[PDB]
Design a protein around this nucleic acid. Structure first.
Ligand SMILES: CCc1c(C#N)c(S[C@H](C(N)=O)c2ccccc2)nc(N2CCCN(CCO)CC2)c1C#N
Ligand SMILES: Nc1ncnc2c1ncn2[C@@H]1O[C@H](CSCC[C@H](N)C(=O)O)[C@@H](O)[C@H]1O
Ligand SMILES: [Zn+2]
Ligand SMILES: [Zn+2]
Length: 842
DNA sequence: GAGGCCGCCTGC
DNA sequence: GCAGGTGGCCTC
């Protein structure tokens, strides 16, 4: 007695009769109108949707199609969202008309044609500002990846326009994109139909193309004896090594024993579908036959064959396998090197997923035969880099070909000088970024040096990593902290974005940026960008997956102006230890991931400490010669890349801190075996290089939790070892080889694992910090063999810096420059994603 | 300026 | 209980 149709039906598709207008009590609804629905739980707020179709079902009565909006508080923004902002989402369903509560007005707030000149909002307007009091949307939202994007431009046909749901259309396109399909048929064999090409996840595969496959897809025919398993830890003299018992965990940080294998690689020989006795092919079960390629490490030459080889070198093999097309992880190029027109280096650097071979491998004879014969630019963005440091981020972007950094802002003079030495075309402001922005906003044209300040329209890309000081805690945010946030460098960096309105924006930070203050810093940062009208997303990347022998997880925020394509995060290139690759983020009990799909493998093997620095000459503790001979050619692929094509007669900055006599003696007594650290130190007297004697540590107290040695000796060094008893300021010992403070507080610091710890050749670096110190928190900084801390050059190599990359200042200045930097290989991978967006703009 | 010293929290 | 993560504040 309320719902009655207006007019007659438009179409009668079976048991549905469609209409264009319906009357509900005193209101009339038409296709395109927006309505509210009460949730089943009356406490929850109203649902909101657009009506895309109206019909009568001959069994279920009056129906409509609801394309739901998403409330801002249901996105990652949460309670920081504008109360009246909605977001488009790909969610819709059929619903009885009786569930409609009321008609509502929803406005599309489009960015203006002058959007890039509308910046200059107060930071209060950025963080807390709202709009006029009516529902509105401006962005589309991806709930799984936390991506805000410009609304899709999907258009209907002249047939479905009367019931066109954009969500239904995009979901149908996504299902079409995912499902594997055969395209062009080649020959009809008795049992199967052969195809020339097939498609999957938007990629075209043809006979002769290379394919990535999971390591589980096939085995190699090579027969091998079982490798010798890791030996059981032998007992030790508890009196001579009193702290060795603290290594009961049997876990080695920086170890590569549990890194996965990289992809199998094959060349498609056949694409085929089984044919029923009917004769039609079964096109839901597509199969491929491939020839297996061997990586050097897959031959009877084990892992050591990978040491010198190019990371994209393969061997042909005549072994074949059949796998499901569904198992293919991606398409790659595998070419015969001698038949390539260019040199292998120009080929290898010209594009992603490029491999080559020269020889073939015979598993049965364990020999290397020769393969059978049946195998055969846009203008750069003007970039402002804020908090530029010595320029690791700018270097990677320049390597990706997208960026000319014309302006850099860096308050610390040594890093600014380093940036200048590497960027002679750039204007480098050695200035507080807060001061510079105030000058520009006041209408100044030059800073106090006479340097021309960038103006609106000059800056097309903005990038930087702003440090966090006062809000790095994980506790709640209060009046003091939030005031400290409103005046923080993060907000200053966002103010640069609001003023200049670049095409692309990148904010990089430590991983914990995503969780600081219960993730409020992240949430407020995303809210600012959305308020400005930017598309944006966030994620966590592991630098080791992009080509360095270093675990370094970093938080990344990417934003793109309206009119641009929002970039994707780059797919991992190198496999890396899975414990170091925890990239997901929880925001208000919701788990967010990035678009990255390579979760378990990748095209290239992991980069190791050996790859990084096996070619550097031996130097001593305190080495200070700034210019020395390399004494030989680069040995690994990684070293060949970082040394460059041009011959380098001189190796620079292979210098080390001059550790004191005691610390030097400790380093000399750290064993070379992998996993060695302070817990392996002998409890002996040692005469030091300056005449000092290093004293023996003696156990003066009882640790019931830790127990007693094999021969009954105590294991405590302080009265604080008792539950309650305070620190006795006389049990502290000095000039001890085993550092007193480590057994003193080791019970609540995981036994200070890694301090005075050696790198291992097969492993990776711990995070490269600004000042390598064996008794710091990241203490695993000893050379694998030499009795010293890693050099400046070795730290720069762990960050993927080219050896030509200039640093400036004393040795602590240079360590700080290197330790603060974004690894160029990570920044290059990000830049190539931005490059795809530049080329795809239309 | 150096070296020693060493809390609090998250995610399992 | 384990592993990682955040460097900085005395004291010389
Ligand atoms: C694991 C090493 C470490 C580290 C490490 N790494 C840190 S980090 C530091 C901090 N104050 O907690 C920090 C936290 C957030 C933002 C910046 C710095 N603190 C530690 N404390 C122990 C007591 C000393 N007390 C002296 C103040 O300097 C600092 C706290 C310790 C330790 N043992
Ligand atoms: N107010 C401020 N204005 C400008 N630079 C600042 C600043 N406060 C700190 N800095 C600088 O900001 C930098 C943060 S580290 C950034 C490293 C850089 N992304 C790279 O890839 O090399 C440091 O070099 C520090 O000196
Ligand atoms: Zn729909
Ligand atoms: Zn004590």
């Amino acid at each position: 007695n309320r719902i009655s149709w207006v007019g007659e039906a438009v179409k009668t598709d079976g048991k549905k009769s469609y209409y264009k207008k319906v009357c509900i009590d005193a209101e009339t609804l038409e296709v395109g109108d927006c309505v509210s629905v009460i949730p089943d739980d009356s406490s929850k707020p109203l649902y909101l949707a657009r009506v895309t179709a109206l019909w009568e079902d001959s069994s279920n009565g009056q129906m409509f199609h609801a394309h739901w909006f998403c409330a801002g508080t249901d996105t990652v923004l949460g309670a920081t969202s504008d109360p009246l902002e909605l977001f488009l989402v790909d969610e819709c369903e059929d619903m009885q008309l009786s569930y409609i509560h009321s008609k509502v007005k929803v406005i599309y707030k489009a960015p203006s044609e002058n959007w890039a000149m509308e910046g200059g909002m107060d930071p209060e307007s950025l963080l807390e500002g709202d709009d006029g009091k009516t529902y509105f949307y401006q962005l589309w939202y991806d709930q799984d990846y936390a991506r805000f994007e410009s609304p899709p431009k999907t258009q209907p046909t002249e047939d479905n326009k009367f019931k066109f749901c954009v969500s239904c259309a995009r979901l149908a396109e996504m299902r079409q994109k995912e499902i594997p399909r055969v395209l062009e048929q080649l020959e009809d064999l008795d049992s199967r139909v052969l195809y020339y090409s097939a498609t999957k996840n938007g990629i075209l595969y043809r006979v002769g193309d290379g394919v990535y496959l999971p390591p589980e897809a096939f085995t190699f025919n090579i027969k091998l004896s079982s490798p010798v398993k890791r030996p059981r830890k032998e007992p030790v003299d508890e009196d001579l090594y009193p702290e060795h018992y603290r290594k009961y965990s049997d876990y080695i940080k920086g170890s590569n024993l549990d890194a996965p294998e990289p992809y199998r690689i094959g060349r498609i020989k056949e694409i085929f579908c089984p044919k029923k006795s009917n004769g039609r092919p079964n096109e839901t079960d597509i199969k491929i036959r491939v020839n297996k390629f061997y990586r050097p490490e897959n031959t009877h030459k084990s892992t050591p064959a990978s040491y010198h080889a190019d990371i994209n070198l393969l061997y042909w093999s005549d072994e074949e396998a059949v796998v499901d097309f569904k198992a293919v992880q991606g398409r790659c190029t595998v070419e015969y090197g001698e038949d390539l027109p260019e040199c292998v280096q120009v080929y290898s650097m010209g594009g992603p997923n490029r491999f080559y071979f020269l020889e073939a491998y015979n598993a049965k004879s364990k020999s290397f035969e020769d393969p059978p014969n049946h195998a055969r630019k846009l203008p750069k963005l003007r970039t402002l880099d804020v908090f530029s440091g010595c320029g690791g981020l700018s270097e990677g972007f320049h390597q990706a070909g997208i960026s000319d950094t014309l302006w850099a802002i860096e308050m610390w003079d040594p890093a600014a000088q380093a940036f200048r030495l590497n960027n002679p075309g750039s204007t480098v402001f050695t200035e507080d970024c807060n001061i510079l922005l105030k000058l520009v906003m006041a209408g100044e044209t030059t800073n106090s040096r006479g340097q021309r300040l960038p103006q609106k329209g000059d800056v097309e890309m903005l990038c930087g990593g702003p440090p966090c000081q006062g809000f790095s805690g994980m506790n709640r945010f209060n009046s003091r902290t939030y005031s400290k946030f409103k005046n923080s460098l993060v907000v200053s960096f966002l103010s640069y974005c609001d003023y200049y309105r670049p095409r692309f924006f990148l904010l990089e930070n430590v991983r914990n940026f995503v969780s600081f203050k219960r993730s409020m810093v992240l949430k407020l940062t995303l809210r600012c960008l959305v308020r400005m009208g930017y598309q944006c997303t966030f994620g966590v990347l592991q630098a080791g997956q992009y080509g360095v022998a270093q675990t370094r997880r970093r938080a990344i925020i990417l934003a793109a102006a309206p009119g641009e394509k929002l970039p994707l995060f780059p797919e991992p290139l190198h496999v890396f230890a899975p414990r170091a690759c925890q990239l997901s983020v929880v925001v208000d009990d919701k788990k967010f991931v990035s678009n990255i799909t390579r979760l378990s493998s990748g095209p290239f093997r992991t980069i190791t400490v050996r790859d990084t620095m096996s070619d550097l000459p031996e130097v001593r503790n305190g080495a200070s010669a700034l210019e020395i001979s390399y004494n030989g050619e680069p040995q690994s692929w990684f070293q060949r890349q970082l040394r460059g094509a041009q011959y380098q007669p001189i190796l620079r900055d292979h210098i080390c801190k001059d550790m004191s006599a005691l610390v030097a003696a400790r380093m000399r007594h750290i064993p070379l075996a992998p996993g060695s650290d302070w817990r392996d130190l002998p409890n002996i007297e040692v005469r030091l290089s300056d005449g000092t004697m290093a004293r023996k540590l003696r156990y003066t107290h009882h640790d019931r939790k830790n127990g007693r040695s094999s021969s009954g000796a105590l294991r405590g060094v302080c009265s604080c070892v008792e539950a309650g008893k305070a620190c006795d300021p006389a049990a502290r010992q000095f000039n001890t080889l085993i550092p007193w403070c480590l057994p003193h507080t080791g019970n609540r610091h995981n036994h200070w694992a890694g301090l005075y710890g050696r790198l291992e050749w097969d492993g990776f670096f711990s995070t490269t910090v600004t000042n390598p110190e064996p008794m710091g928190k990241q203490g695993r900084v000893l050379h694998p063999e030499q009795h010293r801390v890693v050099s400046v050059r070795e730290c720069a190599r762990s960050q993927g810096f080219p050896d030509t990359y200039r640093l400036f200042g004393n040795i602590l200045d240079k360590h700080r420059q290197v330790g603060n930097a974004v690894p160029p290989p990570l920044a290059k991978a990000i830049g190539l994603e931005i490059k795809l967006c530049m080329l795809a703009k239309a």
